[PDB]
Design a protein around this ligand. Structure first.
Ligand code: PLM
Ligand code: PLM
Ligand code: BA
Ligand code: BA
Length: 130
């Protein structure tokens, strides 16, 4: 079971700077990161997921089992204990630090929406071969 598996790169994003400011990302990383089209690699095996996000020289590796407590390293470096759930084959939902994160795969397009209060941080990525 590998619905999400693959490599994807950022096409566009909305509200990057506002959101990164709100969550405590150092401004010098905010200034670098803003026009970076980061790459996400996802390995799904049934309920078990591994995902690696690359944005410049920064590389974050995460894993979780759906339905189970996991520890997710966020943008700042903060590690948060949470549960990631599937809502259908093609949608990953979690909440941490009052942020709602929804990751939806539609064919070759992944849409990631993080909302914290009124701020809706949306990222659209596209599959980039194997
Ligand atoms: C130290 C390396 C130099 C550049 C680092 C800039 C910091 C990266 C900022 C890009 C944020 C993209 C990650 C968003 C993760 C997600 O929404 O799921
Ligand atoms: C810094 C990442 C925070 C954790 C995000 C919740 C984990 C569940 C979803 C994992 C998919 C990661 C999103 C990859 C798509 C993207 O880079 O925009
Ligand atoms: Ba599918
Ligand atoms: Ba939670």
């Amino acid at each position: 079971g590998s619905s999400f598996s693959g490599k994807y790169q950022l096409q566009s994003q909305e509200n990057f700077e506002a959101f990164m400011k709100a969550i405590g990302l150092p401004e010098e990383l905010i200034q670098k990161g803003k026009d970076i089209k980061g790459v996400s690699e996802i390995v799904q095996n049934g309920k078990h997921f591994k995902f690696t996000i690359t944005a410049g020289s920064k590389v974050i590796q995460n894993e979780f089992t759906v339905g189970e407590e996991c520890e997710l390293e966020t943008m700042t470096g903060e590690k948060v204990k949470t549960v990631v759930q599937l809502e259908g084959d093609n949608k990953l939902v979690t909440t941490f630090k009052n942020i709602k994160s929804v990751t939806e795969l539609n064919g070759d397009i992944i849409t990631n929406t993080m909302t914290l209060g009124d701020i809706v941080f949306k990222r659209i990525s596209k599959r980039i071969g194997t």
